[PDB]
Design a protein around this ligand. Structure first.
Ligand SMILES: Nc1nc(=O)c2ncn([C@H]3C[C@H](O)[C@@H](CO[P@@](=O)([SeH])OP(=O)(O)O)O3)c2[nH]1
Ligand SMILES: [Mg+2]
Ligand SMILES: [Mg+2]
Ligand SMILES: [Mg+2]
Ligand SMILES: [Mg+2]
Lengths: 176, 176
DNA sequence: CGGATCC
DNA sequence: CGGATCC
């Protein structure tokens, strides 16, 4: 897939917001715009993008086997490179050029952890995770853990998570 | 990529044996037939194949960065799905149809370990590796290890390795 | 079972 | 740093 500008990326996401769905035992189920979050370098507002990253919030655990493996995009040509329940990489046709669209799934209880992880950048995550690791924690896209056990934080948003973990909140574009 | 018969697989490999090369800083370097080993289900003589698996023996460590990342196949149309120094998955055109060709690299000192690993089947490797793990060993495609340290076995062929590890030698078709 | 490539 | 999907 080719490289994209920030504006092209934003246009693609806007187009996708009303056109994503999945087939669930023969029933086409629309994915709601409020359950679609732009993540990756697009959310970080980088000028050129290697691809478009979208996080899909899935309301029930039982649906994970169905959402990405039966993804549908109304009116857009695409093919599937790799796909499972948690990551699906698509090549899409947009204005006669091919681009990479990366789809990820999070459960509702994972959402802020997923947003934080998929926003990156990678260097920033490594640093954050290394610091938490010194205190016997493990942070991933699913939660904060200690001794392989979920640490139940009383948080809803990404901003609350970042502050609860003991770090300075920064807007996605200023994370490093 | 589509499914193949064993005889189609054998025909593809035969065709490839004289046509594989890599570009090394602008220089086309032929890969020799003696350094190309059929592995996977093809070596196990299964009647249908999901793909063709080839192991390429690379004579120097410095070449690993060049071989698969600059692979060339004379006269054959192909595209690259994923590729690094150790695994490269290609989709090739053969007669009217697209098939998957999986390429792997081993260094000369790894060869018997690589052949054993890439022959499979997976179930057989799991069983073998589980048994070795009980005795505090780790077996992979690169060597036999204990406490993260290479166990220098005095072996050259796959048959010698299998017997040295304490298992019954079986021909690839009879491994399970 | 264990590793490669990719996110 | 940590995990997904694939070999
Ligand atoms: N240790 C180990 N774990 C695995 O999951 C695994 N998957 C594949 N392989 C090795 C053995 C296979 O014969 C070879 C080629 O990969 P394929 O998926 Se084309 O398997 P095959 O159907 O046997 O041709 O790589 C594996 N080896
Ligand atoms: Mg991206
Ligand atoms: Mg991406
Ligand atoms: Mg195979
Ligand atoms: Mg294969």
């Amino acid at each position: 897939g080719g490289m994209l500008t920030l504006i092209q990326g934003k246009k693609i996401v806007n187009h996708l917001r009303s056109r994503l769905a999945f087939e669930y035992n023969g029933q086409l189920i629309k994915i709601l715009s409020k359950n679609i979050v732009a993540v990756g370098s697009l959310r970080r507002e980088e000028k050129m993008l290697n691809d478009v990253d979208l996080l899909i919030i899935v309301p029930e655990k039982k649906l994970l086997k169905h959402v990405l493996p039966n993804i549908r995009i109304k009116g857009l040509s695409f093919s599937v490179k790799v796909c499972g329940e948690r990551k699906c990489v698509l090549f899409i046709e947009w204005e006669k050029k091919t681009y990479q669209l990366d789809l990820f799934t999070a459960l509702a209880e994972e959402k802020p952890y997923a947003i934080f992880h998929f926003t990156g950048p990678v260097s920033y995550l490594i640093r954050i995770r290394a610091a938490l690791k010194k205190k016997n924690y493990k942070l991933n896209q699913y939660g904060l853990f200690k001794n392989q056990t979920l640490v139940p934080l009383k948080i809803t948003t990404e901003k609350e998570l970042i502050k609860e973990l003991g770090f300075t909140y920064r807007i996605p574009k200023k994370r490093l």
